């Protein structure tokens, strides 16, 4: 099969900003109680308040209780 795409061998390089990118990870501190409450929140939000086209309701990602 004929191939049109081509790649250039010149890679432009520049410097990214130098700052402290480390960030807290709150999800690592979620308890079982926390997760269950959040699954409850999402199921209610997605059921009654989130707009979903009629033909894509089978794709809505509900969560276990």
């Amino acid at each position: 099969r004929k191939i049109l795409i081509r790649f250039s061998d010149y890679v432009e390089v520049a410097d990214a900003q130098d700052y402290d990118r480390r960030a807290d990870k709150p999800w690592t501190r979620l308890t079982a109680a926390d997760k269950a409450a959040i699954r409850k929140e999402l199921n209610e939000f997605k059921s009654t308040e989130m707009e979903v086209h009629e033909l894509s309701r089978h794709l809505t990602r509900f969560h276990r209780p």
Partner: protein, 294 residues
């Protein structure tokens, strides 16, 4: 009415300030960005048909000052045309500034600036990994529900000059026809499995002949053989995706039949990776521009 030039200006003004400084938009301004950009997403196909010249970028993850530098590097819109591959929010500290600038540029240059949906542009994921918390702290819960309706309308994939297929994650076992993507109706959630899930979650893996397990516990991995028969099937030349951190900001797979792009350098301050963009010109000649941590 919307004051778009004012928002973009305020958003770009912090350029040169100390990273972390907050751009202070009003609640009503943010909802204006979400509503107008949503309208545009819905007026364009869910499978974008785009034309070079174009610069393609990967994950940003709320590293707002790395996004500003990216635009410094490649040109602030409309100096260059842009296609982003998703994962704008979460993990980073300034997901609001990031997504607001991106939405604002989509409204400013709707024919020259494009955003694909990442797996973090869905409710269940960005409820946990920061963006929800960022919205609640700085504004209210309703603003996060407003962003959700905007993310549920993002396009999912893009084909550049009928030869480069673009999406966040990768391929799907359920993807037998491009028409299957075109028939996906918006607004929609990202499901826990199936085509739309795989398009945002799958990963290449050289160790897998066809399909395999994904360490993420979602979707699958896929091999070079899958990529080869896919490009041949649809007469494509390349798959362009993001989703995974790679050392040089870009990384090829299956003899350059697929490329991973990642644009957040020094990701989470845990990796020493560069962030990269891919330029495609009218000749369909591709080149890579990277921002490396010094």
């Amino acid at each position: 009415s919307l004051n778009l030039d004012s928002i973009i200006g305020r958003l770009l003004e912090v350029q040169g300030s100390r990273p972390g400084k907050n751009v202070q938009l009003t609640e009503n301004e943010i909802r204006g960005l979400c509503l107008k950009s949503r309208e545009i997403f819905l007026s364009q196909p869910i499978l974008l048909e785009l034309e070079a010249p174009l610069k393609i970028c990967g994950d940003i993850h709320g590293q707002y000052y790395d996004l500003l530098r990216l635009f410094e590097y490649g040109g602030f819109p409309p100096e260059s045309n842009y296609l982003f591959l998703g994962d704008y929010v979460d993990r980073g500290k300034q997901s609001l500034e990031t997504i607001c600038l991106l939405l604002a540029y989509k409204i400013k240059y709707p024919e020259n600036f494009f955003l694909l949906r990442g797996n973090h542009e869905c409710a269940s994921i960005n409820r946990i990994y920061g963006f929800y918390d960022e919205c609640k702290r700085r504004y209210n819960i309703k603003l996060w529900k407003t962003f959700t309706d905007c993310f549920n309308c993002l396009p999912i994939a893009a084909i550049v000059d009928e030869k480069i297929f673009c999406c966040h994650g990768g391929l799907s076992p359920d993807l037998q026809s491009m028409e299957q993507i075109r028939r996906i109706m918006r607004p929609t959630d990202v499901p826990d499995q199936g085509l739309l899930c795989d398009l945002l979650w799958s990963d290449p893996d050289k160790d897998v002949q066809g399909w395999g397990e994904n360490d993420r516990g979602v979707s699958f991995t896929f091999g070079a053989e899958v990529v080869a028969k896919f490009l041949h099937k649809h007469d494509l030349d390349l798959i362009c995706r993001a989703h995974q951190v790679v050392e040089d900001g870009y990384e090829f797979f299956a003899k350059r039949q697929l490329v991973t792009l990642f644009s957040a350098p020094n990701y989470c301050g845990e990796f020493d990776n560069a962030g990269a963009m891919m330029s495609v010109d009218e000749t369909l000649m591709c080149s890579f521009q990277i921002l490396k941590p010094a």
